[PDB]
Amino acid sequence: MVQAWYMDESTADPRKPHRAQPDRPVSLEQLRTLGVLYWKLDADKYENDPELEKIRKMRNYSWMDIITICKDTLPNYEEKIKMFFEEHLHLDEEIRYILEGSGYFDVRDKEDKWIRISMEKGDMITLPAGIYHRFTLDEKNYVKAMRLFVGEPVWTPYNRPADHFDARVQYMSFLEGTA
Ligand SMILES: CSCCC(=O)C(=O)O
Ligand code: NI
């Protein structure tokens, strides 16, 4: 099952697991209280998968593309990787479905503590508009992912602080309503 955990207090080597000690695992149920949703799929079938279609139709994910994060392949790699890992929010959902490889999505919990979510092949996640988050490769230094979007995409990150946005205000309001 998909693994997530509270992080330790080391700021070094962000691609390491950084598991809090003792272990403080985080469940999919706790992630849902943050508005973070998850589906498990057969990533070998991504070109033609009725199960992915069920999710895309339910959620109105009408747009997709594929991105490959690789030190050799990706244009403007070093700058893009830095922008992924700066703590930021978006005014839309961030939806990613991992097709190959792996990485970490970090999200803030209700007390603004970091939770690290380990995403591997077959894992699909949506991070709600307004949530503070970041992404890093793990020590294997490779991921291929499908990006999805509700309509034509706008990718703009707003690096924290970004508290004035309506999307952030509405998200804070959502958090009051969950466990
Ligand atoms: C696993 S997708 C690569 C990360 C990314 O697209 C993002 O942070 O927006
Ligand atoms: Ni983002």
From Swiss-Prot:
This is Acireductone dioxygenase. Ni(2+) binds at residues 88, 90, 94, 133. Belongs to the acireductone dioxygenase (ARD) family. GO terms for biological process: L-methionine salvage from methylthioadenosine. Its EC number is 1.13.11.54, 1.13.11.53. The gene is Adi1. The lineage of its organism: Eukaryota, Metazoa, Chordata, Craniata, Vertebrata. It is found in: Cytoplasm; Nucleus; Cell membrane. GO terms for cellular component: cytoplasm; nucleus; plasma membrane.
